[PDB]
Design a protein around this nucleic acid. Structure first.
Length: 294
DNA sequence: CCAGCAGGGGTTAGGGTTAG
C-alpha cells in the first residue's frame, strides 16, 4: 500500500516536504520555548556527509524525537525543508512523525516513538542497520559519556545517573542529588540548602553519601528538575565540573562542583531514561554492587 | 501520523557552554 520515499540529505530542496533517515550528530532535548510549544533542535547526517539541522515544535513532549544520545538513528516523516538565513533547515510540518533507534551495532531494532501507529517495512530495518554500520566507521564515539570516576575538573560531560534527592535553593537554582555507583576523584561539593527541604529517602541518602554528587541546575532547568521523580534514571547533558579550592588560614580543601548552567546550547538539559534503555541496565548493575558495599 | 485522510491556525527558534 503506502510506500514512503526517503530523500538523501544531499538531495534536499527548499520548498518541499520530505522523509529522511539520519544519525544524530547533535540535539537539544525538548525544552519550553517562549511560545506555546516544546522545541527540539536536531542535527542529523547520513552517508553523504551532508548535515541537516531540524527545528521541531510540539505541544506533546514525547511527540518530539525520542533521542537519548548522539549516534541515535532517527527517521522523520513529513519534515518541511526551507531556507532560513541562506541555510537549509528542516522544520515541523503538519503530521510530522518521528521514529528513533539505538545506534549500537547488533542491538535489536526497536522503534522509539509516541505514534500509536507507524509504517515500518523490512527496508526500514535494513536502512537502520546500514546507518549503524556507517556511524560506527565514520563518527568518533563520544568522549563525553563518562562515569563519575572518570570525570576531570573544568570539563563538560554527559552523566547517566539515578536521582536520589531534590531540594529548592534560591528560586533561580535547584539541587539534584544523583549517583551512578562510582566515586568521583575528588569529593563532591555540598550545596547550602535547608534540611527540611530535602525530598527523598533520607536514610538511603545518608548511607550513599560517599557516592552521591550534588548538581546545581539553573534558570530553565529548575522547572524541569522540580518535576523529576526520585529514583528515576536520568541523563544530564553538558554538566560542568569545577574543582573548587577553599583555603582558610591553615587548611586547603579540594571539592568538585557540578553545575547545569542556564540555556540550551551544547544540549544542556535533562532527559528521563526508561528502564528498557540498555545504558540503564548497565547503570543498574553498578548501582546494585555499589549499594551492596556502601 | 492522524482529529482530520477530497489534508492538517496562528508562535515558538533558527546548535556553539558568562555564571550563579
Amino acid at each position: 500500500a503506502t510506500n514512503y520515499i526517503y530523500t538523501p540529505l544531499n538531495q534536499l530542496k527548499g520548498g518541499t516536504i520530505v522523509n529522511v533517515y539520519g544519525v544524530v550528530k547533535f540535539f537539544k532535548p525538548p525544552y519550553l520555548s517562549k511560545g506555546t510549544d516544546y522545541c527540539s533542535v536536531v542535527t542529523i547526517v547520513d552517508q553523504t556527509n551532508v548535515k541537516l539541522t531540524c527545528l521541531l515544535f510540539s505541544g506533546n513532549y514525547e511527540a518530539l524525537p525520542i533521542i537519548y544520545k548522539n549516534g541515535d538513528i532517527v527517521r522523520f516523516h513529513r519534515l518541511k525543508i526551507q531556507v532560513y538565513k541562506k541555510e537549509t533547515q528542516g522544520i515541523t510540518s503538519s503530521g510530522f512523525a518521528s521514529l528513533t533507534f539505538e545506534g549500537t551495532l547488533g542491538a535489536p531494532i526497536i522503534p522509539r516513538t509516541s505514534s500509536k501507529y507507524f509504517n515500518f517495512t523490512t527496508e526500514d530495518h535494513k536502512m537502520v542497520e546500514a546507518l549503524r554500520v556507517w556511524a560506527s566507521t565514520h563518527m568518533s564515539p563520544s568522549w563525553t559519556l563518562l562515569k563519575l570516576c572518570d570525570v576531570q575538573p573544568m570539563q563538560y560531560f554527559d552523566l547517566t545517573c539515578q536521582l536520589l534527592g531534590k531540594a529548592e535553593v534560591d528560586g533561580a537554582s535547584f539541587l539534584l542529588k544523583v549517583w551512578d555507583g562510582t566515586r568521583t576523584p575528588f569529593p563532591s561539593w555540598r550545596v547550602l540548602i535547608q534540611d527540611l527541604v530535602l525530598e527523598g529517602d533520607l536514610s538511603h541518602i545518608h548511607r550513599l553519601q560517599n557516592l552521591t554528587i550534588d548538581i546545581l541546575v539553573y534558570d530553565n532547568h529548575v522547572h524541569v528538575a522540580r518535576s523529576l521523580k526520585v529514583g528515576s534514571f536520568l541523563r544530564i547533558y553538558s554538566l560542568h565540573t569545577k574543582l573548587q579550592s577553599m583555603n582558610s588560614e591553615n587548611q586547603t580543601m579540594l571539592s568538585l562542583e557540578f553545575h547545569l548552567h542556564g540555556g540550551t546550547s551544547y544540549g544542556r538539559g535533562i532527559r528521563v531514561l526508561p528502564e528498557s534503555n540498555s545504558d540503564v541496565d548497565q547503570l543498574k548493575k553498578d548501582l546494585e554492587s555499589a549499594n551492596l558495599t556502601a
